Symmetry: C3
Subunit: 145 residues, 3 copies
C-alpha cells in the first residue's frame, strides 16, 4: 500500500522537477549564446551548462533505482533523507559547473557520498533479506555430520 | 496487487518499444550516411536523427517516474491516458526533427503539456496524501488556546 | 510484499553497480588521455570508452522498466535470469568497445537477445492479464444472436 512509499514518491517527484529545471536552463543557454539544434558545441559557457544537464540525466535512473530499493529493503525515512542530500548536491553541482568546470568537483563528491550511501543501504537490506534463509539451507545440508 | 498497475505497466512497455524503435532508426542512419562509431557527428540529416533519439532517451525516466507516481497517487486511467498522449507526441517529435530541426518544436510542446500535466497530477495526489495529517498535527498543537 | 520482488531488486542493484563501474572507467580515461570537461572528444581510445558508457546509460532505463514488468507479470526467476545475462553481455560489451569499435558488436547482439526476450515476456504477461476479460466482454455483447 501507498502509505509506506509516499516519502520515496515525494523525493522522486522532487528529482523530476529538478531535471525539468536543468532542461529549461539548457534551453535558455541555447538562446543566450545562440547555439542551435542540432549542435551541442559552441562557446564554453554553453558547453558547461549542456554537460551539467547531461551528466545529471545519466545519473537520474541510478538515483531512482537505488532510492526505491534502499527505501523498501532498508528504511524509508533514511533513504528519502539521502535522496534529498543527493538532489541538493546535484543542484549545487549544476550551478557550479555552469560558472566554472572546476566548481563542479566539490558538489560532485557530495553527491557521490550520498549515492554510495544509498547503495550501501540497498546492499545491507538485501543481505538481511537473503542471508538468513541461505545460511539455514546450508546448515540443514550439514545435517547429519 | 497487479490488477491496479496493469495499465501503467502497459503504457510503460509501449514506451520501451518506442525507444527501441528510435534506436533502430539511429542504427540505420549510421549505415545510410556512413557515420560510424565512435563519432556522433556527420551530415546534418544524420545528426538530427541522433539528437532526436538522445533527447527522447534523456526524458524517458522522467516520463516513467512521473507516470508511476501519478498513476498510483492520483488515478491510474488518467495517468495512462497522458502517458499515451506523451508517447504519441514523442513519435511525432522524432519524425519531425529527422526531416527538419524546425519540425521538432510543435510536437515538443505537445509532449511538454502532457508531461507537465502528469507532474500536476503527481503533486496533487501527494498533497491529498500528506496534507490532511499535516494540518491535523498543526491544529492539535494549537490546543490549547 | 517484498518477498516476491527481491530477486528483481537484487538484479537492479547489480545493474547500478555496473553503471557505477563504467562511470569510474570514463573518469580514469579522462586522466590517462588528458581529455578534460567539458569536451567529450579526444584520442579515439578515449572516445570509445566514453561512448561505451553513454550507450550503456541510454539503455539502463529500458532494462529496468522491462525487468520489473516482466518480473511481475510473467515470472520473477526468469526475468532475473535474463537480467543477469543482459548485464553480463553489457560488461563484455563495454570491455570490447574500449579495445576496439569492432569488438562491441558480438556482445551488443547478446545484450539485444536478452533484452528482446524480456520484452517478449513482458508482452506475454500483459496479454495473459488483459486478454481473458477482453474476450469475455466481447462475447457477452454477442449475446444474443
Ligand atoms: N539536452 C537538451 C535539453 C533541452 C531540450 O530538451 N531542448 C529541446 C528544445 S530547444 O532547446 O531546442 O528549443 C530540444 O529539442 N533540443 C534539441 C536536442 O536535444 O537536440 C538540448 O541539448 O537541447
Ligand atoms: N545512440 C546510439 C543508438 C543506437 C545504438 O545503440 N547503436 C549501437 C550499434 S551500431 O549502430 O554501432 O551498429 C552502438 O553500439 N552504437 C555505438 C555508440 O553508441 O557509440 C548510437 O549513436 O549508436
Ligand atoms: N559521462 C561522464 C562520466 C563520468 C563522470 O560522471 N565524470 C565527472 C567527474 S570528472 O571525470 O570530470 O572528474 C564529471 O563531472 N564529468 C564531466 C561531464 O560529464 O561533463 C563524463 O564524460 O565525465
Ligand atoms: C526501478 C525501481 C523499482 C521500484 C520497485 C517498487 C516496488 C514496490 C512494491 C513493494 C511495496 C511494499
Ligand atoms: C521509479 C518509479 C517507482 C515506481 C513505484 C511503484 C510502487 C508500487 C507499489 C504500490 C502498489 C499499490
Ligand atoms: C519503472 C518500473 C515500474 C516498477 C513497478 C513496480 C510495481 C510493484 C507493485 C506490485 C507488487 C506485487
Ligand atoms: C523524513 C524526511 C523525509 C523528507 C521527504 C520530503 C520530500 C519533500 C520534497 C517535495
Ligand atoms: C558513482 C558516482 C560517480 C563518482 C564520481 C566522484 C568520485 C571522484 C573520483
Ligand atoms: C534463491 C536464490 C537466492 C540468491 C539471491 C542473491 C542475492 C544477493 C543480494 C546481495
Ligand atoms: C527464518 C529462519 C531463520 C533461520 C536461521 C538462520 C541463522 C543465521 C542468521 C545469522
Ligand atoms: C483507459 C485508457 C488506457 C489505455 C492504456 C492501454 C495501453 C496499450 C499500449 C500497448
Ligand atoms: C519539461 C519538458 C521540456 C519543456 C520544453 C518545451 C518548452 C519550450 C520553452
Ligand atoms: C512526515 C514528513 C512529511 C513531509 C513530506 C512532504 C511531502 C510534500 C508533497 C508535495
Ligand atoms: C485522518 C483525519 C483527517 C484530519 C482532518 C484534517 C482536516 C484538514 C483537511 C482540509
Ligand atoms: C534464480 C536466479 C536469480 C539470481 C539473481 C541473483 C542476483 C545476484 C546479484 C548480486
Ligand atoms: C533494442 C536493442 C538494440 C538492438 C541493436 C542490435 C541489433 C543489430 C541490428
Ligand atoms: C480496460 C482497457 C484495457 C486495454 C489495455 C490494453 C493492454 C494491451 C497489453 C499488450
Ligand atoms: C475471468 C473469466 C474468464 C473469462 C473467459 C474468457 C475466455 C477466453 C480465454 C481464451
Amino acid at each position: 500500500h501507498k502509505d509506506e512509499v509516499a516519502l520515496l514518491a515525494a523525493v522522486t517527484l522532487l528529482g523530476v522537477l529538478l531535471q525539468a529545471y536543468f532542461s529549461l536552463q539548457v534551453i535558455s543557454a541555447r538562446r543566450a549564446f545562440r547555439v542551435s539544434p542540432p549542435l551541442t558545441t559552441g562557446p564554453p559557457e554553453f558547453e558547461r551548462v549542456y554537460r551539467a544537464q547531461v551528466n545529471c540525466s545519466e545519473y537520474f535512473p541510478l538515483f531512482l533505482a537505488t532510492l526505491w530499493v534502499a527505501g523498501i529493503f532498508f528504511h524509508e525515512g533514511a533513504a528519502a533523507l539521502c535522496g534529498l542530500v543527493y538532489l541538493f548536491a546535484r543542484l549545487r553541482y549544476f550551478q557550479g559547473y555552469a560558472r566554472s568546470a572546476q566548481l563542479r568537483l566539490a558538489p560532485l563528491y557530495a553527491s557521490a557520498r550520498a549515492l554510495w550511501l544509498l547503495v550501501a543501504l540497498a546492499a545491507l537490506g538485501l543481505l538481511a533479506h537473503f542471508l538468513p534463509a541461505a545460511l539455514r539451507a546450508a546448515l540443514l545440508g550439514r545435517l547429519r555430520t
